[PDB]
Ligand binder design. Structure first.
Ligand code: 60B
Length: 298
């Protein structure tokens, strides 16, 4: 029927890693900054440790472990392992710049058209990968895109990934609970809108119960001021009633790539290009045996 999933679930000892501080806490649970020092390997891996004690909560986090351990792509977040304590912990890669939503709000005055369009390509690449792996995210939003470096983003939060966020949801999903790769494309359009508005809340003030009626009337998120009709038209195509009329993630990679080659023709930002963001070629970006998870293999 379907291919056997031969992904390895790595069980890590409590003694192999340390929590440093809390990175974030909320409805999603609690995420901690940490260091993973495996065996007698002479490596220090910067990690993020997630924990949602209740049997039903352990079931849900293990469902996220299942999906997260099964993905392997540069623009998707993979599970490093799990720790079996009183509460089951997920051990993941530290994304030092946090989520993209807060990044675009905090660094607005230094974010240019090249960065914005490249993030779009990268999110579409990650999403296309999930489509190839026959996985429907069901929760794509700017809050679920993490920043490794300002030039490298990855999709996370597999707590809803299968084979409620109303304001990011396709109309078929709100009305009929129908989720497809084409419903993820709707959420992708909303994610792009969030980036182009430098982290604006979609349909601010409007209660979730009113959204279904709003979309049925033909109302969509407005054209952001920096967006050319070329970029807005793409967002609009992601918000069509007919799912099959929406672009495919492979077409979004193409469209945004063409645009990323001449970003000033597609996004109009006051004082663009003169804008600078931290790079691994810049100053101060034990620390001796530190290795990123992307370089720490099997
Ligand atoms: C502020 C902050 N700094 C971080 C550094 N590194 C990661 N690392 C990773 C890597 C892969 N996945 C995750 C992850 C999975 N689910 N979530 S979440 O539920 O917190 C998501 C809704 C924000 C984060 N974190 C996460 C970080 N955060 C999050 C709390 C947003």
């Amino acid at each position: 029927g379907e291919a056997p999933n031969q992904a390895l679930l790595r069980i890590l000892k409590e003694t192999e890693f340390k929590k440093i501080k809390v990175l974030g806490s909320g409805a999603f649970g609690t995420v901690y900054k940490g260091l993973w020092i495996p065996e007698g390997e002479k490596v220090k891996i910067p990690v993020a440790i997630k924990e949602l004690t209740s049997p039903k909560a352990n079931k849900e986090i293990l469902d996220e472990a299942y999906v997260m351990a099964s993905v392997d792509n540069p623009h998707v977040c993979r599970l490093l392992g799990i720790c079996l304590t009183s509460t089951v912990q997920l051990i993941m890669q530290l994304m030092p710049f946090g989520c993209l939503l807060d990044y675009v709000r905090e660094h607005k005055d230094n974010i240019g058209s090249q960065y914005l369009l490249n993030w779009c390509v990268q999110i579409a690449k990650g999403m296309n990968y999930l489509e190839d792996r026959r996985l429907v995210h069901r929760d794509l939003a700017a809050r679920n895109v993490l920043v490794k470096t300002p030039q490298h983003v990855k999709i996370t939060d597999f707590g809803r990934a299968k084979l409620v966020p109303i304001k990011w949801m396709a109309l078929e999903s709100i009305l009929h609970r129908i989720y497809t790769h084409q419903s993820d494309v709707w959420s992708y359009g909303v994610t792009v809108w969030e980036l182009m508005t430098f982290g604006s809340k979609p349909y601010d003030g409007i209660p979730a119960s009113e959204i279904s009626s709003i979309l049925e009337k033909g109302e969509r998120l407005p054209q952001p001021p920096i967006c050319t009709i070329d970029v807005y038209m793409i967002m609009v195509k992601c918000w069509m009633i007919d799912a099959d009329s929406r672009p495919k993630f492979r077409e979004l990679i193409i469209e945004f790539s063409k645009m990323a080659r001449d970003p000033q023709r597609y996004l109009v930002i006051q004082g663009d290009e003169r804008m600078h963001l931290p790079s691994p070629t810049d100053s101060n970006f034990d620390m001796d045996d530190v290795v990123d998870a992307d370089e720490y293999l099997i």
